[PDB]
Amino acid sequence: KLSLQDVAELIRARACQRVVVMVGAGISTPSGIPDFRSPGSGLYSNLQQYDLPYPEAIFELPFFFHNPKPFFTLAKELYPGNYKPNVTHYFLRLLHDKGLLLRLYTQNIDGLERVSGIPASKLVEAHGTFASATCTVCQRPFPGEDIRADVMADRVPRCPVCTGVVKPDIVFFGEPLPQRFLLHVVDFPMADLLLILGTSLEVEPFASLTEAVRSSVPRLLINRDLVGPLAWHPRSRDVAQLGDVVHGVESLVELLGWTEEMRDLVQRET
């Protein structure tokens, strides 16, 4: 089997020059944002006070059309927080600074990839963004700040033209993904390394991307535990660094010899 040191040596020799990355909410728990499925602390274990038929309903499009108030109540709790990127985000920026990042596919809606300096064309926000919004009736677009302003004032955002409910451009369950998700069609067959960080690989079609790389390509998981195909459909060149994501990234950085570059980047940015 391959080790983490083997992956670091492949990168250092530039045998791997074209890295695709898949991330989820586990990369932002070190920044103070809860994930969805962790025992005790995950969002799905902490929605009892909301007016929901079941927890998952708060992120489902048909329920949003039925009653959007629980979703906006929850959003009011994320807007004020001044979350910052952590070492995981800056490591992905360092990959770009070294010319190794092919594309970063994220499920997160916290915006921290952009804050850490990943350029828009290298980034696929596969489940959308709070940065923009769309009227659910007339489909007119609006900046995300308008929605933020209404929500923090305890109002459901309504369209100034038709009075329909205006929704942030996040992909709810049951909603189409953005067109740029289709970059995966070319990105994954030519990637020469896949990095998977902080995700349960439970949501589709995002999770199916893990099988789109070639069988000859290593898949490196940095996560608290084995998940998805890495758990039940493993491949011979899979590597798992099971533990905290910041500790795993710092270990990889040390094996790569990138400690000075990481420190310089974090200093500049913080």
Binding site: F173, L177, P178, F181, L182, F206
Partner: peptide, 9 residues
């Protein structure tokens, strides 16, 4: 038609 919908599976 080519754009997929998000599911729990």
């Amino acid at each position: 038609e080519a754009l997929p919908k998000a599911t729990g599976g």
